[PDB]
Design a protein around this nucleic acid. Structure first.
Ligand SMILES: O=C(c1ccc(-n2nnc3cccnc32)cc1)N(c1ncccc1Cl)[C@@H]1CCCNC1
Ligand SMILES: [Mg+2]
Ligand SMILES: [Mg+2]
Ligand SMILES: [Zn+2]
Lengths: 57, 50, 61, 84, 153, 26, 52
RNA sequence: AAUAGGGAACGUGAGCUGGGUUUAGACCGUCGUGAGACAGGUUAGUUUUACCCUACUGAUGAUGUGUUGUUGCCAUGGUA
RNA sequence: AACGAGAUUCCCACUGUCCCUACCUACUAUCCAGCGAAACCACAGCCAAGGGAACGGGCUUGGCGGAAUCAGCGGGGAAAG
RNA sequence: GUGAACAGCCUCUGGCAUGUUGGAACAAUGUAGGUAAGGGAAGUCGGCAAGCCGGAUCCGUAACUUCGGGAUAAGGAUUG
RNA sequence: GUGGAGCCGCCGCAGGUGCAGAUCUUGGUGGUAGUAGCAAAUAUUCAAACGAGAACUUUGAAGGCCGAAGUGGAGAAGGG
RNA sequence: AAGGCUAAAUACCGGCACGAGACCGAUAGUCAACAAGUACCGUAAGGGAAAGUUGAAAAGAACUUUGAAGAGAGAGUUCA
């Protein structure tokens, strides 16, 4: 019910302006700009995808 | 435009300072005939064009 | 007797629209002395600008 | 759809102001100028319009350094300063 | 300033004038003709009843398409209209007329409006907006008015 | 006592003459 | 006058539009925008027999 | 009862309708090397203004009988 | 065959398209307060016949002709563009 | 909220003074919207415009076909 | 009559020497004319206030519409 | 001859200055006698105006009066 707007001066939903939204301690549902999703390293030498483990994606 | 290069808002700052009337003392000098500023720009009738 | 500045600023300190704000046409020149917001917050506590709450939209039917 | 409904899509500029003549004639897509023809070394003037020289010949502006060469001439360009 | 037909007896006659004021000219011409030769405290009570639509004003020369009304028959005419701005500027001037008559020491309840003429002022301009991208002008027509007030005695 | 302003030339754009061409097949 | 009135780019309007066939100046904007250009008839015009 | 012939700028478009004509699209036939053409056939195709004068339909009226009202006369016009 | 704001014919159903128009409402138009343009315009604007550039408003011979105007009208002004 | 729906329609949050003016009256012509007995294209170049049918469930669905279609063909019923 | 600083006869000379028309150029003004018009998106009403002045400004009360693909909230471009 | 220089006599609608005119005298003369290649138009090349005068001296109307003011009516300056 509480319509909420962008906070940065890019008014599109492009590849880098995509978010989540959270509620502050001042209980206004605000609009929070998130990082993109990391991807883990895939193995060398032609094995199936699904990336490595042990490392921080 | 809200995203203006610095050459523009030192071009706009000249065209704001001159949109301003004659002072009333200069219509009392010896030998003038200007009585109102005729280079006054109003922002709807006549636009700068950049 | 222009009250439109006081109508805007009270609606920016009640966190409401222009519709909701402001009862009490008695003290009307008195609130025309209130220009800063730290006079317009004293008038709420004194009871001269109230919230005038929401039109009821009962779902009982 | 030819006239006033299609003057609504005049939203983006083409000619901005040049740096050598200051004309609003610098064509951004071509990066040259309309009056002076900016990045070429000379100054674009033409004899097929005798008014377009009258706007920009010598003697239309300030002449910060020819109001003195005209003045310095009539004494033979001295360097010894003055008596006292 | 200078009037037309400066009055026959300047000792006992008041005068008044207003210039470059924005009324319509045609609505002012044909109401200054209705009171031309009217006693002042009857004309004052007249021009109230013009604005209240209780007593009309006939249009005589300037009546192109002006509709008909029933209060014109007091004047012997078949046309009329009730201009409550035209008859409200020169209602104000009768106040200006009687202000100069008491300053010259005259009984203001004994004056008539001897002379009155309405003539045109320089028309001020603006513009309208017509079909196919043309401009056609709005122009006003302000008026000059002028009255001499003489008693009959 | 404001100074005089505007009153610029109209400079109206030319439009089309005689509307529809019409004419006679004859 | 060395060259009076010809220092102006103008032409006849040509077609109808209920105007005389005198050359008219071009453009828009200013007052002198559609007026009658050169010719002995017109205001601001080259005189007949510009004297030599 | 009879389904007579006409005229009024081949009455009548600031009254309409746009079917056929009579622009630009297009197809077919014939002719032309060709562009194109054809009282040859076909489908698709922007119809502007009246607020001016007169005419006319109505509506107030003006003259003169001192002023105002009531009841009437009929010149002329139409006419089924 | 399917398809088409494609072109043509006919039927069933439906209806003011018609017989034959009628009534109602809305925004107007109309009257009023305030503001108030334009196109157009030799002079202007009553007809019949004759003559004439062979189809007059004006001339000729007749008919005749009372101020000022309001709402409508499309006959004319071989109207205006 | 209804409903299949971000359709349409009524409302809350949030807007707004009805779009460059107001008042009186309810003539014609108009512009936009409705109805109408009996007949049902007779109108008209042409069913132009308008109207009828229109949602769902359960039945029923032909000629023809490139076997995909046709098809929601048509044609009935039911609904609170 | 207005007006306040120049001007004319005769003899010669020299012309950018005379306007009613050019759908003439430029400036000015009329008849038209207080006329066409100020009619797309439903709609305003009462009192109080400041005011010389209130249908239109503000305030309140009431009746309204936009009705979450808004007559709402924020932007990019453009405007300065 | 297939190599070279060189003063005067000559040309000058750009400029820096000048002088004069059987010139034009604010719709003329340049486009410009004045804040003119300025206002303003066009995306841009480019197109591009209208516009002189109070008086000797501003002595440019203090003041009284009706109006909220625009504006008056008295008074005052000056030869007007
Ligand atoms: O607006 C016009 C329009 C109407 C008349 C004129 N004319 N004709 N002669 C004239 C003389 C002076 C002035 N104007 C004139 C010009 C244009 N339209 C239009 N109508 C019919 C034919 C051509 C057109 Cl373009 C549109 C078209 C689409 C539907 N709505 C109307
Ligand atoms: Mg009888
Ligand atoms: Mg002049
Ligand atoms: Zn440049």
């Amino acid at each position: 019910v509480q319509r909420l707007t962008y906070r940065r001066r890019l008014s599109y939903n492009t590849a880098s302006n995509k978010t989540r939204l959270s509620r502050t301690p001042g209980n206004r549902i605000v609009y929070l700009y998130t990082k993109k999703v990391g991807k883990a390293p895939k193995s060398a030498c032609g094995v199936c995808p699904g990336r490595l483990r042990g490392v921080r994606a | 435009s809200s995203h203006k290069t610095f050459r523009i808002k030192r071009f706009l700052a000249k065209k704001q300072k001159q949109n301003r009337p004659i002072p009333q003392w200069i219509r009392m000098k010896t030998g003038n005939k200007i009585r109102y500023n005729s280079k006054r720009r109003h922002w709807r009738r006549t636009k700068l064009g950049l | 007797s222009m009250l439109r500045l006081q109508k805007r600023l009270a609606s920016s300190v009640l966190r409401c629209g222009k519709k909701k704000v402001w009862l009490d046409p008695n003290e009307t020149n008195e609130i025309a002395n209130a220009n800063s917001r730290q006079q317009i917050r004293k008038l709420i506590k004194d009871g001269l600008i109230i919230r005038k709450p929401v039109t009821v939209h009962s779902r009982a039917r | 759809t030819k006239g006033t409904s299609s003057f609504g899509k005049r939203r983006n500029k083409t000619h901005t102001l040049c740096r050598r003549c200051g004309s609003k004639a610098y064509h951004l897509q071509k990066s040259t100028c309309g009056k002076c023809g900016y990045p070429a070394k000379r100054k674009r003037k033409y004899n097929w319009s005798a008014k377009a020289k009258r706007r920009n010949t010598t003697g239309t502006g300030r002449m910060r350094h020819l109001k003195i060469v005209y003045r310095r001439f009539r004494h033979g360009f001295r360097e010894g300063t003055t008596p006292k | 300033v200078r009037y037309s037909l400066d009055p026959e007896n300047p000792t006992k006659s008041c005068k008044s004038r207003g210039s470059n004021l924005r009324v319509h000219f045609k609505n002012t011409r044909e109401t200054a003709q209705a009171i031309k030769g009217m006693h002042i405290r009857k004309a004052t009570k007249y021009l109230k009843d013009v604005t209240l639509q209780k007593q009309c004003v006939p249009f005589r020369r300037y009546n192109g398409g002006v509709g008909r009304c029933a209060q014109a028959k007091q004047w012997g005419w078949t046309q009329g209209r009730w201009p409550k701005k035209s008859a409200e500027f020169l209602l104000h001037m009768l106040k200006n007329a009687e202000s100069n008559a008491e300053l010259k020491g005259l009984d203001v309840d004994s004056l008539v409006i001897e002379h009155i003429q309405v003539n045109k002022a320089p028309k001020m301009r603006r513009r309208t907006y017509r079909a196919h991208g043309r401009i056609n002008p709005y122009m006003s027509s302000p008026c000059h008015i002028e009255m001499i007030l003489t008693e009959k005695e | 006592s404001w100074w005089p302003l505007p009153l610029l030339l109209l400079l109206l754009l030319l439009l089309g003459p005689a509307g529809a061409r019409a004419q006679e097949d004859e | 006058s060395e060259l009076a009135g010809h220092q102006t780019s103008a032409e006849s309007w040509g077609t109808g539009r209920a105007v005389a066939r005198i050359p008219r100046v071009r453009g828009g904007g200013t007052h002198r925008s559609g007026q009658g250009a050169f010719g002995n008839m017109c205001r601001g015009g080259r005189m007949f027999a510009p004297t030599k």
